[PDB]
Design a protein around this ligand. Structure first.
Ligand SMILES: CC(C)(C)n1cc(-c2ccnc(NCCCNS(=O)(=O)c3ccc(O)cc3)c2)c(-c2cccc(O)c2)n1
Length: 333
Protein backbone atom coordinates (compact mmCIF):
# COMPACT_ATOMS: atom_id res chain seq x y z
CA UNK A 1 0.00 0.00 0.00
CA UNK A 2 2.95 2.29 -0.67
CA UNK A 3 1.66 5.70 -1.71
CA UNK A 4 4.51 5.93 -4.24
CA UNK A 5 4.93 3.88 -7.41
CA UNK A 6 7.96 3.39 -9.64
CA UNK A 7 7.97 3.84 -13.42
CA UNK A 8 10.88 4.10 -15.84
CA UNK A 9 10.77 7.10 -18.19
CA UNK A 10 13.82 7.38 -20.36
CA UNK A 11 16.83 5.53 -19.00
CA UNK A 12 16.25 6.56 -15.38
CA UNK A 13 13.46 5.25 -13.16
CA UNK A 14 10.86 7.64 -11.74
CA UNK A 15 9.25 6.95 -8.35
CA UNK A 16 6.18 9.15 -7.90
CA UNK A 17 3.06 9.34 -5.75
CA UNK A 18 -0.03 7.48 -6.94
CA UNK A 19 -1.78 10.79 -7.73
CA UNK A 20 0.49 11.38 -10.74
CA UNK A 21 -0.39 9.30 -13.78
CA UNK A 22 0.71 8.59 -17.36
CA UNK A 23 4.21 10.02 -16.98
CA UNK A 24 5.96 11.07 -20.20
CA UNK A 25 9.31 12.88 -20.56
CA UNK A 26 8.89 16.45 -21.77
CA UNK A 27 12.60 17.25 -21.41
CA UNK A 28 15.85 16.54 -19.63
CA UNK A 29 17.92 19.01 -17.62
CA UNK A 30 21.20 18.90 -15.75
CA UNK A 31 19.65 19.24 -12.29
CA UNK A 32 17.12 16.54 -13.15
CA UNK A 33 14.86 14.96 -15.72
CA UNK A 34 11.37 16.40 -16.25
CA UNK A 35 8.22 14.41 -17.02
CA UNK A 36 4.70 15.47 -17.91
CA UNK A 37 2.03 13.92 -15.71
CA UNK A 38 -1.63 14.07 -14.74
CA UNK A 39 -2.73 14.66 -11.14
CA UNK A 40 -5.83 12.72 -10.12
CA UNK A 41 -6.25 14.93 -7.05
CA UNK A 42 -5.72 18.17 -8.97
CA UNK A 43 -7.52 17.13 -12.18
CA UNK A 44 -4.85 19.14 -14.00
CA UNK A 45 -1.74 18.17 -15.93
CA UNK A 46 1.57 18.79 -14.16
CA UNK A 47 5.31 18.60 -14.79
CA UNK A 48 7.54 16.63 -12.41
CA UNK A 49 11.28 17.30 -12.24
CA UNK A 50 13.47 14.71 -10.49
CA UNK A 51 16.62 15.90 -8.68
CA UNK A 52 18.86 12.85 -8.20
CA UNK A 53 21.59 13.09 -5.54
CA UNK A 54 21.39 16.89 -5.11
CA UNK A 55 23.71 16.38 -2.12
CA UNK A 56 26.49 14.54 -3.97
CA UNK A 57 27.93 17.73 -5.51
CA UNK A 58 28.27 20.97 -3.56
CA UNK A 59 27.31 22.94 -6.68
CA UNK A 60 24.24 20.74 -7.10
CA UNK A 61 23.49 21.07 -3.38
CA UNK A 62 23.63 24.87 -3.43
CA UNK A 63 21.35 25.06 -6.47
CA UNK A 64 18.93 22.44 -5.13
CA UNK A 65 18.65 24.07 -1.70
CA UNK A 66 18.16 27.51 -3.26
CA UNK A 67 15.51 26.32 -5.72
CA UNK A 68 13.43 24.65 -3.00
CA UNK A 69 13.45 27.64 -0.65
CA UNK A 70 12.81 30.22 -3.37
CA UNK A 71 9.85 28.51 -5.08
CA UNK A 72 8.14 28.44 -1.68
CA UNK A 73 8.98 31.92 -0.41
CA UNK A 74 8.37 33.79 -3.70
CA UNK A 75 5.14 33.58 -5.70
CA UNK A 76 4.52 35.53 -8.91
CA UNK A 77 2.41 35.05 -12.02
CA UNK A 78 5.53 35.03 -14.22
CA UNK A 79 7.62 32.81 -11.91
CA UNK A 80 6.93 29.08 -12.00
CA UNK A 81 5.64 27.81 -8.67
CA UNK A 82 5.84 24.30 -7.25
CA UNK A 83 2.51 22.63 -6.55
CA UNK A 84 4.11 19.82 -4.54
CA UNK A 85 7.50 18.41 -3.57
CA UNK A 86 7.96 14.81 -2.45
CA UNK A 87 10.64 12.22 -1.87
CA UNK A 88 9.92 8.48 -1.99
CA UNK A 89 12.52 7.83 0.71
CA UNK A 90 11.37 7.69 4.31
CA UNK A 91 14.44 8.73 6.34
CA UNK A 92 17.39 11.10 6.14
CA UNK A 93 19.80 8.21 5.61
CA UNK A 94 17.55 6.61 2.98
CA UNK A 95 16.90 9.86 1.10
CA UNK A 96 18.52 10.06 -2.35
CA UNK A 97 16.16 11.80 -4.80
CA UNK A 98 13.84 14.81 -4.64
CA UNK A 99 10.81 15.26 -6.91
CA UNK A 100 9.48 18.74 -7.69
CA UNK A 101 6.00 19.01 -9.22
CA UNK A 102 4.80 22.21 -10.92
CA UNK A 103 2.35 23.41 -13.56
CA UNK A 104 2.81 21.93 -17.02
CA UNK A 105 3.74 24.42 -19.72
CA UNK A 106 2.88 23.78 -23.35
CA UNK A 107 6.14 24.87 -24.97
CA UNK A 108 9.65 26.16 -24.36
CA UNK A 109 10.62 29.76 -25.05
CA UNK A 110 13.16 28.56 -27.62
CA UNK A 111 10.25 27.19 -29.65
CA UNK A 112 8.46 30.56 -29.58
CA UNK A 113 11.62 32.25 -30.85
CA UNK A 114 11.64 29.94 -33.88
CA UNK A 115 8.16 30.97 -35.05
CA UNK A 116 7.51 34.32 -36.69
CA UNK A 117 5.73 36.43 -34.08
CA UNK A 118 3.41 39.42 -34.09
CA UNK A 119 4.39 42.53 -32.15
CA UNK A 120 1.56 42.21 -29.62
CA UNK A 121 2.45 38.64 -28.62
CA UNK A 122 6.14 39.58 -28.61
CA UNK A 123 5.60 42.71 -26.52
CA UNK A 124 3.43 40.65 -24.17
CA UNK A 125 6.05 37.93 -23.64
CA UNK A 126 8.76 40.55 -23.07
CA UNK A 127 6.43 42.46 -20.73
CA UNK A 128 6.02 39.30 -18.66
CA UNK A 129 9.79 38.78 -18.69
CA UNK A 130 10.24 42.24 -17.15
CA UNK A 131 7.48 41.65 -14.59
CA UNK A 132 9.07 38.46 -13.28
CA UNK A 133 12.53 40.03 -13.27
CA UNK A 134 11.11 43.05 -11.47
CA UNK A 135 9.63 40.74 -8.83
CA UNK A 136 12.96 38.91 -8.57
CA UNK A 137 14.87 42.17 -8.10
CA UNK A 138 12.27 43.17 -5.50
CA UNK A 139 13.10 39.93 -3.67
CA UNK A 140 16.78 40.91 -3.80
CA UNK A 141 17.74 38.20 -6.31
CA UNK A 142 19.28 39.02 -9.69
CA UNK A 143 18.96 36.09 -12.06
CA UNK A 144 22.23 36.90 -14.04
CA UNK A 145 21.59 34.00 -16.42
CA UNK A 146 18.23 34.29 -18.12
CA UNK A 147 17.98 31.76 -20.97
CA UNK A 148 15.18 30.87 -23.38
CA UNK A 149 15.13 27.23 -22.27
CA UNK A 150 14.52 28.37 -18.69
CA UNK A 151 11.52 30.43 -19.86
CA UNK A 152 8.40 28.31 -20.45
CA UNK A 153 5.40 29.59 -22.39
CA UNK A 154 1.76 28.52 -22.58
CA UNK A 155 -0.57 28.33 -25.56
CA UNK A 156 -2.42 31.42 -24.29
CA UNK A 157 0.90 33.36 -24.34
CA UNK A 158 1.52 33.38 -20.60
CA UNK A 159 5.21 33.27 -19.71
CA UNK A 160 6.93 31.82 -16.64
CA UNK A 161 10.58 31.65 -15.56
CA UNK A 162 11.87 28.27 -14.44
CA UNK A 163 14.98 29.09 -12.39
CA UNK A 164 16.27 31.81 -10.07
CA UNK A 165 19.66 32.13 -11.76
CA UNK A 166 23.27 32.02 -10.71
CA UNK A 167 24.25 32.49 -7.08
CA UNK A 168 31.92 26.11 -9.15
CA UNK A 169 33.32 22.87 -10.53
CA UNK A 170 30.86 20.37 -11.96
CA UNK A 171 31.86 17.05 -13.55
CA UNK A 172 29.37 16.08 -16.27
CA UNK A 173 28.95 16.12 -20.07
CA UNK A 174 26.28 18.84 -19.97
CA UNK A 175 27.44 22.27 -21.13
CA UNK A 176 26.16 25.61 -19.83
CA UNK A 177 24.49 28.03 -22.25
CA UNK A 178 26.25 31.38 -21.82
CA UNK A 179 25.04 33.28 -24.90
CA UNK A 180 22.64 35.39 -22.82
CA UNK A 181 25.09 36.56 -20.14
CA UNK A 182 25.88 40.26 -19.88
CA UNK A 183 29.32 41.83 -20.41
CA UNK A 184 29.63 42.49 -16.68
CA UNK A 185 29.21 38.73 -16.26
CA UNK A 186 31.36 37.78 -19.25
CA UNK A 187 34.12 40.04 -17.91
CA UNK A 188 33.49 39.36 -14.21
CA UNK A 189 32.85 43.01 -13.45
CA UNK A 190 30.44 43.38 -10.55
CA UNK A 191 26.77 43.52 -11.50
CA UNK A 192 23.49 45.31 -10.82
CA UNK A 193 19.77 44.82 -11.38
CA UNK A 194 19.90 45.73 -15.08
CA UNK A 195 22.29 42.87 -15.77
CA UNK A 196 19.21 40.84 -16.70
CA UNK A 197 18.01 43.43 -19.23
CA UNK A 198 20.91 42.29 -21.41
CA UNK A 199 19.47 38.77 -21.38
CA UNK A 200 16.04 40.11 -22.31
CA UNK A 201 17.91 41.93 -25.06
CA UNK A 202 19.56 38.81 -26.42
CA UNK A 203 16.16 37.09 -26.37
CA UNK A 204 14.20 39.92 -28.00
CA UNK A 205 16.98 40.18 -30.58
CA UNK A 206 16.91 36.45 -31.26
CA UNK A 207 13.14 36.47 -31.77
CA UNK A 208 13.59 39.10 -34.49
CA UNK A 209 16.83 37.81 -36.02
CA UNK A 210 15.89 34.14 -35.40
CA UNK A 211 19.54 33.45 -34.54
CA UNK A 212 21.59 33.71 -31.36
CA UNK A 213 22.91 37.27 -31.28
CA UNK A 214 26.24 36.53 -29.54
CA UNK A 215 27.02 32.81 -29.84
CA UNK A 216 30.50 31.71 -28.79
CA UNK A 217 32.26 28.57 -27.64
CA UNK A 218 34.02 30.63 -24.95
CA UNK A 219 33.54 33.98 -23.23
CA UNK A 220 36.37 35.36 -25.39
CA UNK A 221 34.66 34.14 -28.57
CA UNK A 222 31.37 35.57 -27.31
CA UNK A 223 33.02 38.87 -26.38
CA UNK A 224 34.36 39.06 -29.93
CA UNK A 225 30.81 38.51 -31.19
CA UNK A 226 29.37 41.23 -28.94
CA UNK A 227 31.94 43.87 -29.93
CA UNK A 228 31.68 43.15 -33.67
CA UNK A 229 27.94 43.87 -33.86
CA UNK A 230 27.58 46.29 -30.94
CA UNK A 231 30.99 47.91 -31.35
CA UNK A 232 34.02 48.23 -29.12
CA UNK A 233 33.07 49.66 -25.71
CA UNK A 234 33.74 53.27 -24.80
CA UNK A 235 36.71 54.32 -22.66
CA UNK A 236 34.53 55.00 -19.61
CA UNK A 237 33.49 51.34 -19.69
CA UNK A 238 37.18 50.38 -19.85
CA UNK A 239 38.05 52.42 -16.76
CA UNK A 240 35.37 50.41 -14.97
CA UNK A 241 37.18 47.21 -15.94
CA UNK A 242 39.78 45.70 -13.65
CA UNK A 243 43.34 46.13 -14.97
CA UNK A 244 43.91 42.50 -15.96
CA UNK A 245 40.49 42.40 -17.63
CA UNK A 246 40.92 45.91 -19.04
CA UNK A 247 44.16 44.90 -20.76
CA UNK A 248 42.48 42.02 -22.61
CA UNK A 249 39.61 44.22 -23.82
CA UNK A 250 41.85 47.03 -25.07
CA UNK A 251 44.02 44.43 -26.82
CA UNK A 252 40.97 43.12 -28.66
CA UNK A 253 40.90 44.68 -32.15
CA UNK A 254 38.58 47.67 -32.30
CA UNK A 255 35.23 47.35 -34.09
CA UNK A 256 33.06 50.28 -35.09
CA UNK A 257 30.05 47.99 -34.70
CA UNK A 258 26.96 47.89 -36.89
CA UNK A 259 24.09 50.33 -36.42
CA UNK A 260 20.98 48.99 -34.72
CA UNK A 261 18.76 49.50 -37.81
CA UNK A 262 21.59 47.71 -39.63
CA UNK A 263 21.85 45.06 -36.90
CA UNK A 264 18.08 44.41 -37.01
CA UNK A 265 17.00 45.46 -40.52
CA UNK A 266 13.54 46.84 -41.17
CA UNK A 267 12.82 43.71 -43.22
CA UNK A 268 12.98 41.41 -40.19
CA UNK A 269 10.07 43.37 -38.69
CA UNK A 270 6.66 43.35 -40.39
CA UNK A 271 5.89 46.34 -42.62
CA UNK A 272 2.34 45.38 -43.62
CA UNK A 273 0.56 48.10 -41.62
CA UNK A 274 1.25 51.59 -40.35
CA UNK A 275 0.79 50.26 -36.82
CA UNK A 276 3.35 47.55 -37.61
CA UNK A 277 5.71 50.13 -39.10
CA UNK A 278 5.41 52.04 -35.82
CA UNK A 279 5.75 48.89 -33.70
CA UNK A 280 8.98 48.00 -35.51
CA UNK A 281 10.17 51.55 -34.81
CA UNK A 282 9.32 51.08 -31.13
CA UNK A 283 10.86 47.59 -31.11
CA UNK A 284 14.17 48.54 -32.73
CA UNK A 285 14.38 51.43 -30.25
CA UNK A 286 13.95 49.18 -27.19
CA UNK A 287 16.53 46.73 -28.56
CA UNK A 288 19.03 49.59 -28.90
CA UNK A 289 18.58 50.53 -25.24
CA UNK A 290 18.73 47.00 -23.80
CA UNK A 291 21.68 45.75 -25.90
CA UNK A 292 24.17 48.18 -24.36
CA UNK A 293 27.56 46.86 -23.22
CA UNK A 294 27.93 49.39 -20.41
CA UNK A 295 25.39 48.79 -17.61
CA UNK A 296 25.28 52.51 -16.81
CA UNK A 297 24.00 53.19 -20.32
CA UNK A 298 21.73 50.14 -20.25
CA UNK A 299 18.04 50.72 -19.55
CA UNK A 300 16.42 49.80 -16.26
CA UNK A 301 13.69 47.17 -16.08
CA UNK A 302 11.17 49.79 -14.95
CA UNK A 303 12.05 52.12 -17.81
CA UNK A 304 11.70 49.13 -20.15
CA UNK A 305 8.28 48.48 -18.61
CA UNK A 306 7.50 52.14 -19.34
CA UNK A 307 8.82 51.78 -22.90
CA UNK A 308 5.97 52.17 -25.44
CA UNK A 309 6.52 48.71 -26.92
CA UNK A 310 6.26 47.16 -23.45
CA UNK A 311 3.93 49.71 -21.87
CA UNK A 312 0.74 48.86 -23.79
CA UNK A 313 0.44 45.49 -22.04
CA UNK A 314 0.81 46.94 -18.54
CA UNK A 315 -2.46 47.48 -16.67
CA UNK A 316 27.09 29.13 1.83
CA UNK A 317 29.32 26.04 2.08
CA UNK A 318 28.40 22.80 3.83
CA UNK A 319 29.55 19.20 3.92
CA UNK A 320 27.70 16.85 1.58
CA UNK A 321 26.15 15.14 4.60
CA UNK A 322 25.14 18.58 5.88
CA UNK A 323 23.69 19.48 2.48
CA UNK A 324 21.64 16.28 2.40
CA UNK A 325 20.10 17.12 5.79
CA UNK A 326 19.40 20.68 4.64
CA UNK A 327 17.66 19.50 1.46
CA UNK A 328 15.79 16.78 3.36
CA UNK A 329 14.32 19.30 5.81
CA UNK A 330 13.19 21.40 2.84
CA UNK A 331 11.38 18.39 1.38
CA UNK A 332 9.65 17.84 4.74
CA UNK A 333 9.11 21.00 6.79
C1 LIG B 1 15.47 22.73 -15.64
C2 LIG B 1 14.15 22.24 -15.01
C3 LIG B 1 14.35 20.79 -14.52
C4 LIG B 1 13.76 23.17 -13.82
N1 LIG B 1 13.09 22.25 -16.08
C5 LIG B 1 11.72 22.47 -15.88
C6 LIG B 1 11.06 22.38 -17.16
C7 LIG B 1 9.56 22.56 -17.41
C8 LIG B 1 8.67 22.99 -16.38
C9 LIG B 1 7.28 23.14 -16.67
N2 LIG B 1 6.72 22.89 -17.89
C10 LIG B 1 7.54 22.47 -18.90
N3 LIG B 1 7.01 22.20 -20.23
C11 LIG B 1 7.19 23.21 -21.37
C12 LIG B 1 8.60 23.04 -22.08
C13 LIG B 1 8.94 21.60 -22.33
N4 LIG B 1 9.45 21.23 -23.81
S1 LIG B 1 8.57 20.61 -25.21
O1 LIG B 1 9.41 19.67 -25.84
O2 LIG B 1 8.20 21.62 -26.15
C14 LIG B 1 7.10 19.72 -24.73
C15 LIG B 1 5.97 20.37 -24.21
C16 LIG B 1 4.79 19.71 -23.83
C17 LIG B 1 4.73 18.37 -24.00
O3 LIG B 1 3.54 17.69 -23.60
C18 LIG B 1 5.75 17.61 -24.51
C19 LIG B 1 6.93 18.31 -24.89
C20 LIG B 1 8.96 22.31 -18.67
C21 LIG B 1 12.23 22.10 -18.07
C22 LIG B 1 12.30 21.90 -19.58
C23 LIG B 1 12.01 20.68 -20.22
C24 LIG B 1 12.11 20.53 -21.63
C25 LIG B 1 12.53 21.61 -22.43
C26 LIG B 1 12.81 22.76 -21.76
O4 LIG B 1 13.25 23.90 -22.52
C27 LIG B 1 12.73 22.96 -20.41
N5 LIG B 1 13.37 22.04 -17.36
Amino acid sequence: DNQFYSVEVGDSTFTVLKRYQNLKPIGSGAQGIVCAAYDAVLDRNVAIKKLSRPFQNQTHAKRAYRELVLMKCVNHKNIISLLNVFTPQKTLEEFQDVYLVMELMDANLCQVIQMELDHERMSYLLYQMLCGIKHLHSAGIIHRDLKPSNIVVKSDCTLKILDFGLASFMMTPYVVTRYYRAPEVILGMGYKENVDIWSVGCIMGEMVRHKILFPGRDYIDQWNKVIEQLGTPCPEFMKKLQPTVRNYVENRPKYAGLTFPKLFPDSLFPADSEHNKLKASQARDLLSKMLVIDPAKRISVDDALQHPYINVWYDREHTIEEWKELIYKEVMN
